[PDB]
Amino acid sequence: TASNNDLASLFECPVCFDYVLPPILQCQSGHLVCSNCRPKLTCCPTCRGPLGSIRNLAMEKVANSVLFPCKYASSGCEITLPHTEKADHEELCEFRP
Amino acid sequence: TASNNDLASLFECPVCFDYVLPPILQCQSGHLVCSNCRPKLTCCPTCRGPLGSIRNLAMEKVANSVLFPCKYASSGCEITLPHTEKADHEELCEFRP
Ligand SMILES: [Zn+2]
Ligand SMILES: [Zn+2]
Ligand SMILES: [Zn+2]
Ligand SMILES: [Zn+2]
Ligand SMILES: [Zn+2]
Ligand SMILES: [Zn+2]
């Protein structure tokens, strides 16, 4: 059936391909942007509609069921983490630059 | 970790407690209502904001990873179904009235 990596990929930011973690915002048509890309943009990167601040509460609840890969996976980190632990892990991760 | 019934419950309509299936709409603040309850309402049953028609595309994608219980589970149906098969199953289900 369904897998954790299948669910996690639904949170990928279409701009940086890191993960969109709570709080999760979206445009009128349902496109996501992460917290870090959002301030560098004047509109939705997918549809060019306004970014806005519609709240995707349901996706935040899904996120409590997903283990998200460390942002340093491409440097060789194999740890996957609940979203509440991801930031603290990445700050001390063996594979950070 | 996470379970299928945990994910499925995130789709429960807060009005009838059946499941909100694609296409999934939501209010400004992220509350869901199913296709059948929506026309019987003049505003979001959770926050009383406008119902609107913001599209929760991400939840629709999650839904492709979830097996949803037959609406006649409380009559004793134990079948759980991909959302694309749920309606046809319920039309012939052993446990319909
Ligand atoms: Zn991003
Ligand atoms: Zn958009
Ligand atoms: Zn790491
Ligand atoms: Zn309903
Ligand atoms: Zn609402
Ligand atoms: Zn059934």
Curated annotation (Swiss-Prot), chains A, B:
Q: In which tissues is it expressed?
A: Widely expressed at a low level. Down-regulated in advanced hepatocellular carcinomas.
* Origin: domain of life: Eukaryota
Recorded consequence of changing R48E: Decreased activity
ZnF start-end (RING-type): 13-48
What does the entry say induces or represses the expression of this protein?
May be induced by p53/TP53, suggesting that it may be required to modulate p53/TP53 response. The relevance of such activity in vivo is however unclear and may not exist.
**Outcome of substituting H31A:** Loss of function
Which of this chain's residues are annotated to bind Zn(2+) 1?
Answer: C70, C77, H89, C93
Recorded consequence of changing C27S: Loss of function
Effect ascribed to mutating C13S: Loss of function
Q: Where in the cell is it found?
A: Cytoplasm; Nucleus
PTMs? This phosphorylation disrupts SIAH1 interaction with HIPK2, and subsequent proteasomal degradation of HIPK2.
Tell me the domain comment. The RING-type zinc finger domain is essential for ubiquitin ligase activity. The SBD domain (substrate-binding domain) mediates the homodimerization and the interaction with substrate proteins. It is related to the TRAF family.
Return the similarity comment: Belongs to the SINA (Seven in absentia) family.
Which disorder is it connected to? Buratti-Harel syndrome: An autosomal dominant neurodevelopmental disorder characterized by hypotonia apparent in early infancy, global developmental delay, delayed walking, language and speech delay, impaired intellectual development, and dysmorphic facial features.
- Any idea what job this protein has? E3 ubiquitin-protein ligase that mediates ubiquitination and subsequent proteasomal degradation of target proteins. E3 ubiquitin ligases accept ubiquitin from an E2 ubiquitin-conjugating enzyme in the form of a thioester and then directly transfers the ubiquitin to targeted substrates. Mediates E3 ubiquitin ligase activity either through direct binding to substrates or by functioning as the essential RING domain subunit of larger E3 complexes.
Q: How does it assemble?
A: Homodimer. Interacts with group 1 glutamate receptors GRM1 and GRM5. Interacts with DAB1, which may inhibit its activity. Interacts with UBE2E2. Interacts with PEG3. Interacts with GAPDH; leading to stabilize SIAH1. Component of some large E3 complex composed of UBE2D1, SIAH1, CACYBP/SIP, SKP1, APC and TBL1X. Interacts with UBE2I. Interacts with alpha-tubulin. Interacts with PEG10, which may inhibit its activity. Interacts with KHDRBS3. Interacts with SNCAIP.
The name this protein goes by in its record: E3 ubiquitin-protein ligase SIAH1
Which species expresses this protein natively? Homo sapiens (Human)
Q: Gene that codes for this? A: SIAH1
